[PDB]
A paper describes a structure:
To investigate how activated NC toxins can utilise small pyrimidine nucleotides as substrates, we determined the structure of Vn-ExoY bound to 3’dCTP in complex with actin-ADP at 2.2 Å resolution (Vn-ExoY-3’dCTP-2*Mn2+:actin-ADP-LatB). To our knowledge, this is the first structure of an activated NC enzyme in association with a pyrimidine nucleotide substrate analogue. In this structure, Vn-ExoY adopts the same overall conformation as observed in the complexes with actin-ATP, 3’dATP and two Mg2+ or Mn2+. As with 3’dATP, the LID of Vn-ExoY is closed on 3’dCTP, and two metal ions coordinate the phosphate moiety of 3’dCTP. In the NBP of Vn-ExoY, 3’dCTP is stabilised by the same residues and types of interactions as 3’dATP. However, the coordination of Vn-ExoY with the nucleotide ribose and base moieties is characterised by fewer and weaker hydrogen bonds, along with fewer hydrophobic interactions with 3’dCTP compared to 3’dATP. On the triphosphate moiety of 3’dCTP, the phosphates and two metal ions are tightly coordinated and less solvent-accessible than the nucleoside moiety, which is very similar to 3’dATP. However, in the structure of Vn-ExoY bound to actin and 3’dCTP-2Mn2+, the hydrogen bond network around the ribose and base is weaker than that observed for 3’dATP. This weaker interaction likely reduces the stability of pyrimidine nucleoside binding in the NBP of activated Vn-ExoY, which may explain why Vn-ExoY remains less efficient as CC than AC.
ExoY virulence factors are members of a family of bacterial nucleotidyl cyclases (NCs) that are activated by specific eukaryotic cofactors and overproduce cyclic purine and pyrimidine nucleotides in host cells. While Pa-ExoY requires actin filaments (F-actin) for maximal activation, Vn-ExoY is selectively activated by G-actin in vitro. The catalytic domain of NC toxins can be divided into subdomains CA and CB, with the catalytic site located in a groove at their interface.
Author numbering:
A (entry chain A): 5 to 38, 52 to 371
B (entry chain B): 466 to 863
Write the structure that this text describes.
């Protein structure tokens, strides 16, 4: 009778059982029309047209999303959806009509006994044993700043940055051209994503790091491409994640992740700001870069008042914090009375989720 | 001093015992480095102490999934794979008919040959003086060979060594009584070189960091050459996988059913280990996936295990703040190998590693013979997960 937990990421789906400390299934959010979903769509790349149903954290293709959910239940988890209550995650600022459509699909298409829709950032804070603090959630297609007070997100102060890991990989492909390297295809994009995850880091002082890379080979690294050709990466190691702090690197006139965190805290009541500043939680794969917490600590310290105590919490499993949070939430007995039941759905309709 | 986390309490090891291991010290050092480079915890199932010099020599290939016959841990055949499995380790003798069929089918199918057993003077002196596995040699009347005796725990069997010269090397061919008549002892040899094979290194488990968890961790059923060619896109395959797509024998010898149940991370780490050991082109020690995905796992045969961990585990608070170092609670030898002696100690080791953010892969077969099922999803939950749920239930009023 175990509850299911499904984190619908813009790049990866994380699915598993509530009560578990990790998802059992982690696969790409892709549909390859003839249909193939996840790993099989990626493996058969050459004969398929790949589509991402979750552009920028928001579900845009419901036919393809049903395929993902079906693949999650039947092929990945090997469960009958009609037997398990299901917690689904949603992006901060997800439209009411969007969660109504996902509630309608859960009950009418998969026939779930019960279902709950939780904000991804809130689950990440729960996974750190907290109910108050500000979450920086940077995934594959979107980045969010979500201030939370006593279990509840503060919607007026939520920041959205349309810049996450996917844009960083495209930027890394772009700046690798400045060394004579050419990565343009979808397959080559995946090689550059691997280089990004293995060799990139955030510099504490960007200008001094650029100056060090300009006068010595000490920051250089080698990378073996699939065909055995070894390439050399230099300042691109830190210039790529630097875009998170300086979005002008990719032509965006948006403020960096440190500015949006500060701006989010400042739109909150003075009385809770000390609690937000001391409980800054990083979540998502795009916060995995070495040095990002130290750089964030320094950037927030320069913006905040001199005596403000700043704390950055970047757990080692922060790539799975949203999923873990959902598993903690759905596994609590006293939450078993918050699920929207199939009975309540038949009587009220998709509006019950609000 | 004591490791305390929720219901887990570990006392610091009082008097450190030294455990004799069959894995050569130099291979332990390589694996300690691989663990650090790759940021993974690597566990390897036991290797009998007498196999040490055979592996150290680097002259032999080892048994893969096509050679299911057990190696021997006694007599002059110690470290080799007798064709007559009554001369193998105890587990093979317990199911003699099944293991003899394994031995015969591997040879009859071409995945091995029937080879003679030759031992050098260094090996004979080691078995007699170092391990006391063979009794001193004596010239036996008429026969012309040197008689020696060996015990399997239940019975003492006589063996005879004939001085021979193979490839101009002076060796001792092993002989035994088959129906009261002298007979050359047969061991399982490599199907290409015809040389006797040794035991392999069986990965018990590989614990990767939580931050590294992804699609590469999906454990997948072996695919046939056809099923695999249909599932992949040729252009996306590296030269290594393109060669397997173009040669069925190459795919079946290095991939497919020969690996067992494996994930992409493990297929890669198996290559890294084999490459770091300097063992390629038939002499590889790691042939297949970990025991955590082996449906035929025998827990009794998994200890003592050697675990290799990233170096931070050895630091003052490597296991976490106020949690101490791994050497405080587990026996760590000079090469950095953490020696796990039994299922209870393995369960404690896995909980510490899980608490430090390294993911376990549990085999239900590991619970067979246990007083309690230690290796279950619920019992091995991370203490960070359990603690955050306790804190959140208290704060949200649930
Ligand atoms: N994913 C995997 C990995 C391994 N195996 C199993 O692993 C075992 C390998 O054991 P052996 O190497 O044949 O025997 P040992 O007990 O290690 O003894 P020795 O090498 O000394 O003969 C048997 C085989 O069924 C499997 O089925 N699937
Ligand atoms: C290992 C892996 C990681 C990942 O994050 O994958 C997700 C999903 C993936 C979907 C397409 C790809 C061909 C298939 C599988 C890749 C899965 O696209 C990503 O790689 C995109 C494109 S490059 C980038 O940084 N993000 C992110
Ligand atoms: N170690 C890492 N370093 C940098 N980026 C990483 C790392 N691991 C994952 N990422 C990136 O994080 C993104 C996936 O993270 P995730 O939180 O799963 O996103 P989502 O939920 O939107 O799918 C990808 O762009 C991936 O390349
Ligand atoms: Mn996400
Ligand atoms: Mn073995
Ligand atoms: Mn084996």
């Amino acid at each position: 009778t175990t509850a299911l937990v499904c984190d619908n990421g813009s790049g990866l789906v994380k699915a598993g059982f509530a009560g578990d400390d990790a998802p059992r299934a982690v696969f790409p959010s892709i549909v390859g029309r003839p249909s193939y979903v996840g790993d099989e769509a990626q493996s058969k790349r050459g004969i398929l047209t790949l589509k991402y149903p979750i552009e920028h954290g928001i579900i845009t293709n419901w036919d393809d999303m049903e395929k993902i959910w079906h693949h999650t239940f039947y092929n990945e988890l090997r469960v009958a959806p009609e037997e398990h209550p299901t917690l689904l995650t949603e992006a901060p600022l997800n439209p009411k009509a969007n969660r109504e459509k996902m509630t309608q699909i859960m009950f009418e298409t998969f026939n779930v006994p019960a279902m709950y829709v939780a904000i991804q950032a809130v689950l990440s804070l729960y996974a750190s044993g907290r109910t108050t603090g500000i979450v920086l959630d940077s995934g594959d297609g979107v980045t969010h700043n979500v201030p939370i007070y006593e279990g509840y997100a503060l919607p007026h102060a939520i920041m959205r940055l349309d810049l996450a890991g996917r844009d960083l990989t495209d930027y890394l492909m772009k700046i690798l051209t400045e060394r004579g390297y050419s990565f343009v295809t979808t397959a080559e994009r995946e090689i550059v994503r691997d280089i990004k995850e293995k060799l990139c880091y955030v510099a504490l002082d960007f200008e001094n790091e650029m100056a060090t890379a300009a006068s010595s080979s000490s920051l250089e690294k080698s990378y073996e491409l699939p065909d055995g050709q070894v390439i050399t990466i230099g300042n691109e190691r830190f210039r790529c994640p630097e875009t998170l702090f300086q979005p002008s690197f990719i032509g965006m006139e948006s403020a960096g992740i440190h500015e949006t965190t500060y701006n989010s805290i400042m739109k909150c009541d003075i009385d809770i700001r000390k609690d937000l500043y001391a409980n800054n939680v990083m979540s998502g794969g795009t916060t995995m870069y070495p040095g990002i917490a130290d750089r964030m600590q320094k950037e927030i310290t320069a913006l905040a008042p001199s005596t403000m105590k700043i704390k950055i919490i970047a757990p080692p499993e922060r790539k799975y914090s949203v999923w873990i949070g959902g598993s903690i939430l759905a596994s609590l007995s006293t939450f078993q009375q918050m699920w929207i039941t199939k009975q309540e759905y038949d009587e009220a309709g998709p509006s019950i989720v609000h | 001093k004591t490791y305390q986390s929720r219901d887990l309490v570990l006392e610091p090891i009082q008097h450190p015992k030294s455990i004799e291991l069959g894995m050569p010290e130099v291979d332990q050092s390589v694996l300690a480095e691989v663990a650090e480079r790759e940021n993974v915890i690597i566990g390897v199932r036991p290797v009998d102490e007498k196999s040490k010099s055979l592996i150290a020599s680097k002259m032999y290939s080892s048994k893969g999934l096509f050679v299911k016959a057990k190696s021997s841990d006694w007599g002059p055949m110690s470290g080799f794979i007798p064709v007559d499995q009554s001369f193998a380790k105890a587990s093979a003798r317990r199911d003699l008919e099944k293991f003899n069929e394994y031995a015969e089918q591997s040879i009859l199918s071409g995945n091995a040959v029937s080879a003679n057993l030759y031992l050098n003077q260094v090996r004979i002196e080691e078995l007699v003086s170092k391990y006391e596995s063979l009794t001193p040699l004596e010239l036996d009347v008429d026969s012309g060979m040197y008689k020696t005796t060996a015990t399997n725990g239940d019975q003492t069997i006589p063996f005879f060594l004939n001085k021979v010269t193979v490839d101009d090397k002076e060796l001792w061919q092993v002989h035994y009584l088959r129906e009261g008549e002298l007979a050359p002892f047969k061991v399982i040899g490599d199907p290409v070189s015809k040389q006797p094979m040794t035991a392999d290194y069986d990965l018990l488990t590989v614990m990767y960091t939580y931050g590294d968890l992804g699609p590469q961790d999906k454990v997948k059923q072996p695919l046939t050459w056809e099923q695999w060619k249909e599932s992949v896109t040729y252009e996306d395959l590296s030269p290594k996988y393109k060669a397997r797509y173009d040669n069925q024998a190459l795919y079946e010898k290095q991939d497919g059913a020969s690996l067992g149940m494996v994930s992409d991370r493990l297929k890669e780490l198996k290559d890294v280990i084999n490459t770091s050991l300097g063992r390629t082109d038939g002499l590889e020690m790691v042939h297949h996936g970990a025991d955590d995905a082996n449906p035929y796992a025998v827990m009794a045969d998994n200890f003592p295990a050697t675990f290799f961990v990233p170096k931070h585990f050895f630091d003052d608070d490597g296991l976490g703040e106020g949690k101490g170092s791994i050497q405080t609670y587990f026996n760590v030898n000079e090469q950095g190998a953490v020696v796990i002696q039994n299922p209870q100690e393995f369960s404690n080791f896995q909980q510490v590693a899980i608490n430090a953010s390294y993911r376990a892969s549990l085999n239900d077969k590991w619970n067979s013979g246990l007083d309690s099922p230690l290796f279950t999803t619920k019992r091995k939950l991370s203490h960070d997960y359990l603690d955050a749920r306790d804190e959140v239930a208290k704060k949200l009023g649930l």
